[PDB]
Each structure stands twice: as structure tokens, then as C-alpha cells.
Paper text:
Earlier, we reported a phylogenetic connection between phage PM2 and the ssDNA phage FLiP (Finnlakevirus FLiP, Finnlakeviridae), which infects flavobacteria. The resolutions of the localized reconstructions for ΦCjT23 and FLiP were 3.4 and 4.0 Å, respectively. This was sufficient to build the corresponding atomic models de novo. As expected, the structure of the FLiP penton revealed a pentamer formed by five copies of protein P12 (encoded by orf12) with the canonical β-sandwich fold, similar to penton base proteins of PM2 and PRD1. This confirmed that the FLiP spike is formed by a separate protein forming a pentamer sitting atop the capsid integral penton base.
In this study, we report a detailed characterization of ΦCjT23, an icosahedral temperate ssDNA phage with an inner lipid membrane, isolated earlier from a strain of Flavobacterium (previously Cytophaga). The minimalistic structure of ΦCjT23 suggests that this phage serves as a model for the last common ancestor between ssDNA and dsDNA viruses in the Bamfordvirae. Both ΦCjT23 and the related phage FLiP infect Flavobacterium species found in several environments, suggesting that these types of viruses have a global distribution and a shared evolutionary origin.
Author numbering: -2 to 144
């Protein structure tokens, strides 16, 4: 072997495993010095006691992000929720991180409450916009890649 910490060409061929992620980055994300990766998890929220953005920089996240919005029984303001997510899927072509936003528009009648799981491969997670009436929670279950 005598390669870097990531290991390629392993018989483990499954989309959810970190092996698929490593094999994909070593093949279609050249000019990126991939260092050791570890299974990581973190949570961002809207209420006090949590951070609105990831402190890490120049580190690629791969895994499933769980969006969660619930009502806190508070007066409404008629704003919108915006969660801007970077995207390195097309980073090689343009040498930039694509910006993707997941938005649920808030009505005074449509009393929204839903939770869902999505797959993303991003750099940083930021809650650019927020509504004080609701509760927002995002959880990441995947792997962190150091560059």
C-alpha cells in the first residue's frame, strides 16, 4: 500500500459506508490533499445553548443531515427559514463551493411541522435566517474529512 491514511480499492462497495466516500474523493476530487477521516456528529439549533454555524473550516463533511422544525407556541413574525449549505459536488469544475439553500416558507395559517433526512457533502453549515417562533434542529451523522 504505502499510500496516505485513506485506503482505496477496498472490497467494501456500499453507498452509505465511508469507503464509498473515500473512493469517490480519490477519483473525482483530485488536487485535494485528503487527510485522516473520522466518524463525526454535531447538532445546530435555534434556541440558546447552540451554535448557528460550524466552527470547523477547510474540512469536508459527508453524511446525512436531519432537518427538524417544530413550533414553540410563540407569536409569529411572518419571516422565512433559510439554511444555506455549501456543496462540493461540483467543486472540482469551478474551484468553488456551490451554495444550496433549503427554505420552508412560514405562513400565519400554514402551521408547518416536519422532519426529514437528506444527504449532503458540504464544507460549512450556516443558519443565515431564523424565525423566533419556531424551533430548528439539524443533526449530522456521517464522517468528517480533514484537508
Amino acid at each position: 500500500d504505502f499510500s496516505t491514511i485513506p485506503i482505496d480499492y477496498v472490497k467494501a462497495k456500499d453507498p452509505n459506508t465511508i469507503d464509498f466516500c473515500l473512493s469517490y474523493l480519490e477519483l473525482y476530487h483530485t488536487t485535494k490533499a485528503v487527510k485522516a477521516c473520522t466518524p463525526f456528529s454535531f447538532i445546530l439549533g435555534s434556541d440558546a445553548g447552540m451554535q448557528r454555524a460550524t466552527e470547523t473550516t477547510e474540512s469536508l463533511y459527508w453524511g446525512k443531515v436531519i432537518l427538524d422544525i417544530n413550533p414553540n407556541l410563540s407569536p409569529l413574525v411572518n419571516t422565512t427559514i433559510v439554511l444555506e449549505i455549501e456543496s462540493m459536488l461540483s467543486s472540482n469544475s469551478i474551484n468553488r463551493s456551490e451554495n444550496k439553500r433549503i427554505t420552508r416558507y412560514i405562513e400565519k395559517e400554514n402551521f408547518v411541522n416536519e422532519s426529514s433526512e437528506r444527504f449532503e457533502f458540504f464544507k460549512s453549515m450556516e443558519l443565515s435566517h431564523l424565525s423566533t417562533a419556531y424551533d430548528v434542529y439539524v443533526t449530522f451523522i456521517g464522517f468528517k474529512i480533514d484537508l
